[PDB]
Amino acid sequence: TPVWNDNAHGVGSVPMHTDLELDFSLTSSSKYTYRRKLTNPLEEAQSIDLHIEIEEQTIGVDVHALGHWFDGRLNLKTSFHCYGACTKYEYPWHTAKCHYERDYQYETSHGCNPSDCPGVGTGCTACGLYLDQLKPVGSAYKIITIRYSRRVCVQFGEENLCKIIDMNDCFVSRHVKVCIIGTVSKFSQGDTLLFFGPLEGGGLIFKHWCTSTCQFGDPGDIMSPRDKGFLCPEFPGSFRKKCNFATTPICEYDGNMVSGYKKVMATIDSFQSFNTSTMHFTDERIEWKDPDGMLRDHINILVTKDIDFDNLGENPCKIGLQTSSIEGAWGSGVGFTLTCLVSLTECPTFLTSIKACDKAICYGAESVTLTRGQNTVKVSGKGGHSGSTFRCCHGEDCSQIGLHAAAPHL
Amino acid sequence: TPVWNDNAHGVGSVPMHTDLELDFSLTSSSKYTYRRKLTNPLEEAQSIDLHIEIEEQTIGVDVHALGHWFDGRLNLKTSFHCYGACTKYEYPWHTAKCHYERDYQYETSHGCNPSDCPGVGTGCTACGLYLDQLKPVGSAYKIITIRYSRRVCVQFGEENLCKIIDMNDCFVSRHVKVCIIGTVSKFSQGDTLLFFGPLEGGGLIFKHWCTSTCQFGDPGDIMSPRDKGFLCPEFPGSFRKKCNFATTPICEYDGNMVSGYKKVMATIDSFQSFNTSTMHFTDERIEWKDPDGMLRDHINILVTKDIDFDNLGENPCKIGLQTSSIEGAWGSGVGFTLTCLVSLTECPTFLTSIKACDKAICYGAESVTLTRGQNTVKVSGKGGHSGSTFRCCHGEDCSQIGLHAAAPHL
Amino acid sequence: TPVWNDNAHGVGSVPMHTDLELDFSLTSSSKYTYRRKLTNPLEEAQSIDLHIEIEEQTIGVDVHALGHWFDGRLNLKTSFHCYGACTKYEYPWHTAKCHYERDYQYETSHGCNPSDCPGVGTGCTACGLYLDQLKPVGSAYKIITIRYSRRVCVQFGEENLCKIIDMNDCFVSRHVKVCIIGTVSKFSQGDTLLFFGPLEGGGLIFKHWCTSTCQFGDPGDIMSPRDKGFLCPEFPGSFRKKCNFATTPICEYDGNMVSGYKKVMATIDSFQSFNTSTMHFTDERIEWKDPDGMLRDHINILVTKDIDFDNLGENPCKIGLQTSSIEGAWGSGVGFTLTCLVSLTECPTFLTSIKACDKAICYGAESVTLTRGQNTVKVSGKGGHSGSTFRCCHGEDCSQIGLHAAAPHL
Ligand SMILES: *[C@@H]1O[C@H](CO[C@H]2O[C@@H](C)[C@@H](O)[C@@H](O)[C@@H]2O)[C@@H](O[C@@H]2O[C@H](CO)[C@@H](O)[C@H](O)[C@H]2NC(C)=O)[C@H](O)[C@H]1NC(C)=O
Ligand SMILES: *[C@@H]1O[C@H](CO[C@H]2O[C@@H](C)[C@@H](O)[C@@H](O)[C@@H]2O)[C@@H](O[C@@H]2O[C@H](CO)[C@@H](O)[C@H](O)[C@H]2NC(C)=O)[C@H](O)[C@H]1NC(C)=O
Ligand SMILES: *[C@@H]1O[C@H](CO[C@H]2O[C@@H](C)[C@@H](O)[C@@H](O)[C@@H]2O)[C@@H](O[C@@H]2O[C@H](CO)[C@@H](O)[C@H](O)[C@H]2NC(C)=O)[C@H](O)[C@H]1NC(C)=O
Ligand code: NA
Q1: How many CA atoms lie within 13 A of C45 on its CB side?
Q2: Is the CB of B342 under 6 A from ligand 1?
Q3: Neighbours of C160 (CB within 10 A)
Q4: I want to staple A381 with a disulfide (CB 3.0 to 4.6 A). Which of A229, A363, B248, C259 is the partner?
Q5: Which chains neighbour A (Cβ–Cβ under 8 Å, 3 or more pairs)?
Q6: Min CA distance, C168 vs chain B (Å)?
Q7: Topological domain, Lumenal: which ranges (chains A, B, C)?
Q8: Residue A242: closest C-alpha in chain C
């Protein structure tokens, strides 16, 4: 007969037994303070201090750091030999991290040879494209998850409690409820954020950063994921061997010659900037306060001075947690799955959520009806980094250890 | 003087004449149950059973099924003839559903002919690209419309009513109001959902699935919309005829050789997965429950035990409906328009909404001020399938027949 | 000790001292009217007229007008001369606004010359691509900012006040609060809106309109930003010179030949339409009412008849404003920054917002704690046009002049 459930975060109240309601639209980038002495209508001389502090909205973005985007110049060179396979000779572009070679092997002919080459169907004209004058222009981050929150502190008499409240969640206590409701549409999963400097200050949003095909000229075309090593772009144009009598062959390439950075800069007003304040970069995560004062969220504060609220998630159920296994990846839009062993006592069943968390950041949650005794719960999550130890959590309680997920893009 | 309006779904209340309020943030993937005996303060011995059941959030997506995405291999063949027009000969790739031929016609020459061909300016070198080793890898669906809802059942005494409540709509009865407020940003119109298996389980979101230009290597490059017949990708590279004395010409192609499926798999962590539970595929529609427990919505429940709420949409107006005509398409982001003949009586005017619906799914709505007598109302909608009969509807009332829209992509 | 803050738009109330609450979900495209006489419970004969009018939701989009998109035909011509540099001769495509020339200079040869040309390594074969049969097919607009609002008028007794209330903001007066809460996901920043006619009526949303690389065949490939002058697309295919003995060379081009307009039309159902009503185009801004009756927002109205609400933003602080400087651009996703000189009196500090506005449209806001005396406040904004004079504003108060930002895409 009982069907305990703690997935409802909020309260039951009787409107005539409720003393105060604050309801307002608050600038997202603003804090809010409320202080009041709750006095007894005047049948008493007993007063309760109420002190509420709401902090500015914070955004937390789980990301994959993509490394640096580069500007560069596309260069073309020709190397001709009258005799010998193309691989017999070393070419100047061989040291270039990003090069692309097209060979014309065993194709010498009378009207396309230098004066000293009498070869026909011999040797090699090698054409080499390579990037040079490389310079990093910014750091790029792929958005995996976006969350907004406000830190909320409530003092009611001598009770004082602070909590980070996610947007569209509620702060719940015996005498005070604080609910935050809102929506923001600035950032999307899969967007790529580009920071051109120590871009505290701000950055750019790219909605079409190249992924499965990067061609030279694309946003994101030339990337270095870590200090050394490039992900090189494709060069989709064609080579031609230009021929003349008594003349060395000359390679031509008819594709785009202008880097993605230059093409983006040339139409920079087509792209959306954002600003940041009090940035915090950690591995695969960025947190900041967006100073855009045009954005607002909705705050509702309900206070009952005498009778307690009915906490809609109240229950006698008791949970023990440990991690069992993990699969999947950090830094990945596909994500990981954490398997948890969860013990339920003091209730035949309990509808609740089990979360994958590390250091008070949560990366995933599974709603589940647990049965008395042991339960196996799989939690899907996204985000984290190589050093993350994802723990199985229930409310503020977590297991004693956590597990690492695998690296993405292997 | 009267200006009846039923577009407001909700209630007028007097806070001192209201007995109970539940206000909370609920895990989207969780149900919620509230049961209570409403007793008379103690001036009576009369109690009313209140029983509220809120079901897990469901997503309903109107889609266009795009068929299967394929992996495959790009092959190149050459066919040379010393004499004759290129069309005089049948080539091996002619049976390939996806092939592309480039001809060098009447271009034979001394330094590019096999030993037995003395032709000059004759015959044909035919170059043929074709896809083979084709294998379907997943089913793709273009998102047309996204809607979220929760089924809400309220028993108040012997009154019992269940309704599917859309997110950002309200359940309204004489004694109980249930409002659901929320926002989700996981899916967008125009996204393409890819299911790799019986992907109950989950799938991938693609934000850049090819549409007006599909090149080989793109996400979505090789599609079969129905069982037989391909939408073939473009091959944007160039052919070359490689020549040698006393040698048959050899075709070369310098474009990308790697399928879109392989390119996407090679950077799969760049893409966003989603999970599903209790999937229901119907023609051009998918419904499921998203098990992502990180998502929440806001629930407000208001109860008055004695005096009825003031139903803000209450009115004496009476409506008769029939379909008149339709234009436009199902399975289309452009959509259809249903024309309805709507008769108003018992009111000089009535501000309301007329909807296009089939089997309790609604695909479009028009807010309108009707005048006494006959009215012509055009309703824009999107979604449905070839078997849909779109009816003109008002509230829960619909016309006696419905109409079919036309097929998309003709 | 005081910490005045006017960034909270709303009220403090005591639920037992509140007389009326209206709470409902309203069709976005519908107006709403409430009229009532608030009578004194019956201890009096004094009645207060309450009259609330809520207008249909309006969308306001700050845009950059991109000019007209064109359909056209891609044509190819050859021009051969036996002798002379390619630049020595004028070619037919030279007058074409969008043309692309590939030259084969000093490459004549025996098996590729007309009968009257004995040249070897001389002259020129010039290949010219050009667009012709150009026709504008629609007007395109890049979305910079999206905002929704409703005009709200409240009469309470002889007090009458009308205000445009942004979605997720509140109307605040002594006796009536009106809060609007909602979310819409139809349009996104960076989307491109295409109107094919006087498209009052509607248009199409493009999520991938070309920007930093436009190739022929892309959505947005051929644009004319203003009356005269094209932004021409790239032609990424290859030229070939087809050769025969005693024959003039013939240029070939192997790239896509089909315009972006034709490719988009051929799969038009892949794209999302929207409808409009009562459109208003101004420079770099479009406003309309979306007639999509499937969309709803949430309205809460709270009334206290006797005791005033506690206005949570009430304060004694006084502000003087003037513009100081500006940098950045109108019509730009990167935006501008307006620097304001702001004088605070009657308070040691004041937490508030300073806005950049022109003619009652606001383009940006900065939340700031001002100190008594002079303050310098930088406000980031987006939108506007060449004729905008951005003023520094606080609430409904603005400075005496405003400043122009610079043009984008210089
Ligand atoms: C939630 O989804 C994950 C994701 O796995 C799926 O990814 C989709 C995008 C699609 O490609 C699909 O074919 C694929 O299965 C599920 O986890 C996976 O489960 C399979 C089957 O056991 C394993 O082989 C995978 O290694 C595993 N991956 C991860 C990262 O865990 C998961 O089962 C599903 N359901 C739940 C409850 O989480
Ligand atoms: C709502 O919009 C539809 C859509 O029609 C428009 O589609 C735009 C994307 C754009 O291309 C525009 O040029 C086009 O008109 C309107 O319906 C269309 O109306 C025209 C004019 O009568 C007809 O020729 C079309 O067949 C018709 N199409 C459909 C699907 O009905 C519609 O009029 C408009 N208004 C309302 C109230 O629905
Ligand atoms: C808010 O952001 C603007 C934007 O400027 C930045 O744009 C980013 C996309 C990125 O490219 C970054 O490197 C760049 O600085 C800031 O304004 C700019 O500030 C610099 C430094 O003084 C000036 O050189 C620019 O001209 C100026 N541009 C504009 C349009 O004002 C701004 O400082 C930042 N902070 C605030 C409080 O607005
Ligand atoms: Na080419």
Answers
A1: 0
A2: no
A3: 10
A4: A363
A5: B, C
A6: 12
A7: 1-410
A8: C107
